[PDB]
Structure formats: structure tokens, C-alpha cells
Amino acid sequence: KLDIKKTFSNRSDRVKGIDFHPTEPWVLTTLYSGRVELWNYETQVEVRSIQVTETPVRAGKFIARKNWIIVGSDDFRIRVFNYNTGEKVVDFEAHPDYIRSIAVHPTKPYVLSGSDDLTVKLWNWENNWALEQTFEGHEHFVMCVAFNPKDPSTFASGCLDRTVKVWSLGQSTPNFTLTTGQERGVNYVDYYPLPDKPYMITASDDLTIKIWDYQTKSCVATLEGHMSNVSFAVFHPTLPIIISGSEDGTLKIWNSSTYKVEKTLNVGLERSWCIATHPTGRKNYIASGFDNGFTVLSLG
């Protein structure tokens, strides 16, 4: 069903974070070398690059409505840059340990960061980037945070403590805790974006991807299709598929109805670490970051 085309591939140091701009044909990549890059994948031209730090930058997102990128790095800092001028906007110590993941609220001026310090923190850019809340309860590194796109007053965190917690902004205790049975912990969590299913998905070092119903708080399915740690698994915004990537070097595209792998892709950049999908499904674009660079693919 899929006519997959290679749009652009770029060789670089290990890519740890990746994101699509919603209106410009750009991807942001954040590298293990401390560099962050903005690429136009249609013209294949580097728009901007910034040496942010000497430590890995694991997390990076566009905040398009503010013309910003926001990045989190192993030196404990969150930094924000204006992508039009290159100007640094803010630079602060966010956690006393590595930052694994950043999520940006779709309508409110809030950012979440998930950290090895066992917490998620909420920052408010309309209050001078003040720490508004710290979410405590996890017992190992918080690897991934994601707002519920259908209800962004709530969000999920995936953790190496083998749980996903779902939280409410303004509330100190989680709504609930899912014990994943993923005994090597959770590396990633993502929400299904459409109203027809109240589903989330987790990826683990235990080789599995699991689909969860957040209303019944039950596991719908366990999908095992990789030979090494699964770095991520996400629902596509417009196609009935799931995309996963692994330290086995593959991307897999799963049918989201049958839970079968429909395509296995080896882009030849060694281990896969991160994923993004174009937020409005433009050309059904997806992009993944690897040890040896990144690739942008269109799906037809």
C-alpha cells in the first residue's frame, strides 16, 4: 500500500533528536556531538547550524508559533534559539542530570522536560521560563514525555522503572500508573492522535512495542519485531500505521489494524535513535535519526 521514497539523507555524527517544522520544509536534528542543525529537505540545503554545547543534545523541538527551537542537553541545560536570527533566547539549568525528552504544549506557553533526575518539569515561557510544576513519582530515568493531543491538560511519561504515568497539569499525583510488563523499562511513549481509539504506545529494550488503552488501563497488544533495543514507536498522523526504530538498525512500518510489519527499511546508517512525523501529514513525511546521520522519507 506504501510507495516509500527517499526524500533526503544526510551523513553526520549521531542524531539523538529530530523534529519537523509544520509550515517550512525543514527538519531540526540534535546531535551527540553537541551540534544542532536545521535542514531544508526539499532543496537539500543546511539552513542553519549551531554548536550548542560539547555534550550530547538528546532533545529538540520546534516552537513554530514563536519562531524558536528548544533543545535539552547532557550538561543539564535547556536552551532556546530563534531560528530566523540564530539568537539565543534563554539558557537555564533545568535538571541536575541528563534531559531525555522535551514536549511543547500545542496552545499554552508550556514545555515539559523529562530527566534522569526521576522527574518531569513544566516550564512557562510567559512567566520568564519559570518552573511551574515538578512531577514526582517515577523511580528511574524518565525517557520520554508526550502531551495527549486530544487532551493536552494531560500528558504521559515513559520511564526505565517499567511504568508509564499519566499526569494532569496542576495535579501532584498521577492520574494512573501503567506497569508495562516491559521489564527492561520504557524508552518511548506516544499517543494515537485520532478520537476513535484511546490508545498509547510504548517501546522497550525488551524488544517489544505495546499498545495500551488509557481508559481501561489495559494492554491491547504486544508487538515484537526487532532484534535489539526499540528506540521509539509512534502512530502516524494520517496513515493507519505505526513506525518503530531500533538499535538493530531497522525502521519497521506496522499495520495499525493487524499489528503486522508491512515494511522493513534499512537506510544503512547503523543504529536508529529518534523519529518524527510531519504534523499535518504533508507528503506523509517521516524522518529518523541514526548513528551515522538522518533520513527523510515520503510515504504514498
Binding site: 549521531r14 551527540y32 530515568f141 525517557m143 526505565l160
Partner: peptide, 8 residues
């Protein structure tokens, strides 16, 4: 190995 901390 007993431990493989997530540093990569």
C-alpha cells in the same frame, strides 16, 4: 555485563 547505563 551486569549494568549497561544509557549513555549512548
Amino acid at each position: 555485563c551486569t549494568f549497561k547505563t544509557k549513555t549512548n
